[PDB]
Amino acid sequence: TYFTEDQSVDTVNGRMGIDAGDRAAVVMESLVRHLHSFVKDVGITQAEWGLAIDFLTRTGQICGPERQEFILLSDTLGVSMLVDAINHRRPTGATENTVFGPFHVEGAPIRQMGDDISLDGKGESCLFAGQVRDLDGHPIEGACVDVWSDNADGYYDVQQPDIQPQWNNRGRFLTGADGRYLFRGIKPTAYPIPDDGPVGQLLDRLGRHPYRPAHMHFLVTAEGCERLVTHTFVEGDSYLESDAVFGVKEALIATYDRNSDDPATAWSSQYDFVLTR
Amino acid sequence: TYFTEDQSVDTVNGRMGIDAGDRAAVVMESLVRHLHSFVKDVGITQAEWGLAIDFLTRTGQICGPERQEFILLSDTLGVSMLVDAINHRRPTGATENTVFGPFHVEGAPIRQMGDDISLDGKGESCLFAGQVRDLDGHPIEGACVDVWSDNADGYYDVQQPDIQPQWNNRGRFLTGADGRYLFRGIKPTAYPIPDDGPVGQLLDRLGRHPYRPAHMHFLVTAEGCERLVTHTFVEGDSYLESDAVFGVKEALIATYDRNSDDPATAWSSQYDFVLTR
Numbered sequence: 001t002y003f004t005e006d007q008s009v010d011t012v013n014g015r016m017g018i019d020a021g022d023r024a025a026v027v028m029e030s031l032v033r034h035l036h037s038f039v040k041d042v043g044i045t046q047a048e049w050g051l052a053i054d055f056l057t058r059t060g061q062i063c064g065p066e067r068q069e070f071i072l073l074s075d076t077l078g079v080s081m082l083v084d085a086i087n088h089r090r091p092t093g094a095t096e097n098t099v100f101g102p103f104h105v106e107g108a109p110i111r112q113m114g115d116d117i118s119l120d121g122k123g124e125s126c127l128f129a130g131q132v133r134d135l136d137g138h139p140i141e142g143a144c145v146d147v148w149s150d151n152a153d154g155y156y157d158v159q160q161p162d163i164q165p166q167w168n169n170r171g172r173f174l175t176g177a178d179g180r181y182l183f184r185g186i187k188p189t190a191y192p193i194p195d196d197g198p199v200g201q202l203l204d205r206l207g208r209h210p211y212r213p214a215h216m217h218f219l220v221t222a223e224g225c226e227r228l229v230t231h232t233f234v235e236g237d238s239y240l241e242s243d244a245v246f247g248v249k250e251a252l253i254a255t256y257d258r259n260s261d262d263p264a265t266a267w268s269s270q271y272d273f274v275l276t277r
Numbered sequence: 278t279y280f281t282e283d284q285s286v287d288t289v290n291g292r293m294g295i296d297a298g299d300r301a302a303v304v305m306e307s308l309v310r311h312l313h314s315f316v317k318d319v320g321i322t323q324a325e326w327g328l329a330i331d332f333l334t335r336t337g338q339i340c341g342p343e344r345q346e347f348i349l350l351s352d353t354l355g356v357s358m359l360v361d362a363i364n365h366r367r368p369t370g371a372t373e374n375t376v377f378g379p380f381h382v383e384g385a386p387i388r389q390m391g392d393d394i395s396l397d398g399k400g401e402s403c404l405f406a407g408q409v410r411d412l413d414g415h416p417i418e419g420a421c422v423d424v425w426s427d428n429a430d431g432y433y434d435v436q437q438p439d440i441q442p443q444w445n446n447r448g449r450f451l452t453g454a455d456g457r458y459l460f461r462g463i464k465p466t467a468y469p470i471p472d473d474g475p476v477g478q479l480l481d482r483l484g485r486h487p488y489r490p491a492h493m494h495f496l497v498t499a500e501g502c503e504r505l506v507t508h509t510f511v512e513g514d515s516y517l518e519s520d521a522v523f524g525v526k527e528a529l530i531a532t533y534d535r536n537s538d539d540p541a542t543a544w545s546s547q548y549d550f551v552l553t554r
């Protein structure tokens with residue numbers, strides 16, 4: 001007949017004109033099924049529906065050059081981490097992926113080893129070093145170590161374009177024959193995700209804080225290897241067990257050593273990445 | 278301790294700081310549960326995730342004074358009809374609700390009975406008439422009949438702000454003691470929902486058309502009665518069995534009679550509304 005509540009799912013899915021084995025049909029069949037199930041499960045009202053419409057609208061409207069509020073929504077509802085988890089499984093011993101987040105920027109300067117990526121000098125100086133190897137234990141020559149962090153104010157460069165220098169706490173480093181990287185930066189600082197839009201509103205309404213534990217992002221790539229999209233977390237950070245975006249993994253926690261002794265930098269963090277074929 | 282695929286839902290929901298019985302917690306618990314189930318069900322890829330982010334973003338960004346693309350998305354996935362369905366359980370004999378759609382505009386001119394709502398004179402003239410009553414059969418005095426339709430070009434006034442006169446095919450009528458309404462308009466025309474944004478892209482990808490059968494919208498309100506948000510459909514419209522927004526109900530299909538004899542209007546359509554509660 002016409003639409004009924006009991007046949008809502010079949011009614012909507014049955015309008016599709018594409019073959020059932022087309023990937024879009026498989027995805028959309030499940031999306032509609034789950035969406036209808038949700039609405040029925042909690043009895044979404046007309047007013048609640050209107051709230052949702054308004055929220056989704058504002059979420060897209062606040063997106064633009066320096067802000068991806070839909071990524072933040074995905075991130076804070078654990079969707080991003082879940083997508084990473086089911087797609088980027090790897091053997092024991094290989095460094096684990098985690099949530100990408102929205103603040104990677106392609107085409108960062110290719111810098112020299114030992115260069116200082118902290119261009120505004122805000123934070124405590126830190127020496128970052130380690131080795132890229134394959135799963136069989138061999139250093140990889142010509143791996144690209146693409147790194148990004150916030151500054152001491154809790155912001156990535158792209159969040160404060162007219163304040164932070166371009167490429168602040170960003171750089172790309174290409175390993176030599178020994179697989180080693182080394183650069184100077186600052187010790188990362190815990191930061192709230194942008195909380196002045198819908199995502200911040202929702203966290204507030206759920207009695208959730210917006211913070212992530214301090215971390216340095218590493219995107220490590222090499223010919224013939226799976227792309228490693230990860231971060232290292234500052235050991236001891238108070239938010240390690242309450243990351244707003246669910247990104248922490250035990251093995252990604254990095255030690256930070258205080259350097260009275262080597263006063264080139266105040267801190268050092270050593271961390272080795274292991275890629276798979 | 279940390280996020281795992283198999284504990285993804287508990288991990289995310291467990292961060293809520295509000296009481297389990299708070300409406301936001303009930304809704305969001307189910308939203309996260311269903312959203313994670315969906316992602317797992319069909320194995321959303323990183324690329325698919327990225328496509329969704331972009332799509333949701335564009336959907337919100339194209340919203341504005343004259344277009345609610347999130348409503349259209351809700352409508353075309355059957356969510357709007359479903360929310361209307363589960364929030365109404367009216368008695369036998371009361372006129373049924375259906376999908377609101379995005380084109381109602383508050384504060385339409387209060388017109389006299391017999392006034393013509395068709396200001397651009399595009400379409401075949403039609404006389405619309407009927408009676409508002411209660412379930413016991415008594416006319417309702419002082420009901421407001423708030424009506425809106427497209428013009429012959431298949432657009433609501435707000436979709437062509439520089440072309441259509443303001444309030445074209447819109448008006449509010451207040452019933453007298455006999456409960457009767459009467460106005461002149463045009464016979465409505467089948468129309469595609471706006472198909473140049475994400476929603477149109479999606480329908481195209483699913484091999485679905487963007488069309489609705491011809492209809493006149495009626496929002497009927499009265500003191501002490503449930504708000505009636507409905508439409509009447511043009512009998513015999515070839516899209517009655519394939520409404521893009523699933524809004525058709527048998528009882529809302531209206532008969533249209535041709536008037537050779539009184540060529541004041543070409544057509545007349547008589548339809549009574551029965552309010553409840």
Ligand SMILES: CCCCCCCCCCCCCCCCCCCC(=O)O[C@H](COC(=O)CCCCCCCCCCCCCC)COP(=O)(O)OCCN
Binds near residue numbers: 308
């Ligand atoms: C294509 C389909 C599109 C439509 C699909 C429908 C989806 C429905 C799911 C969302 C429904 C959630 C809303 C539940 C409302 C009740 C509890 C939460 C908020 C609530 O209390 O509502 C209001 C306040 O909310 C606030 O101030 C903050 C709430 C923020 C908005 C609600 C959450 C948005 C939904 C998240 C997006 C969906 C995820 C994307 C995949 C006012 O009520 P009150 O009781 O506080 O007032 C009394 C004070 N005097």
Ligand SMILES: CCCCCCCCCCCCCCCCCCCC(=O)O[C@H](COC(=O)CCCCCCCCCCCCCC)COP(=O)(O)OCCN
Binds near residue numbers: 074321330479482
């Ligand atoms: C919290 C945020 C969550 C973040 C998102 C994660 C959730 C996963 C959602 C995944 C949806 C992807 C499904 C699309 C199928 C793609 C695979 C088929 C092959 C292909 O490339 O087709 C594209 C289809 O994508 C398209 O048509 C573009 C994608 C459109 C799908 C998005 C619909 C989402 C519904 C939102 C409801 C709100 C829920 C609130 C609780 C072509 O591209 P094309 O078709 O454009 O080109 C043609 C113009 N006809």
Ligand SMILES: [Fe+3]
Binds near residue numbers: 101215217
């Ligand atoms: Fe980050």
Ligand SMILES: [Fe+3]
Binds near residue numbers: 378380492494
């Ligand atoms: Fe309409």
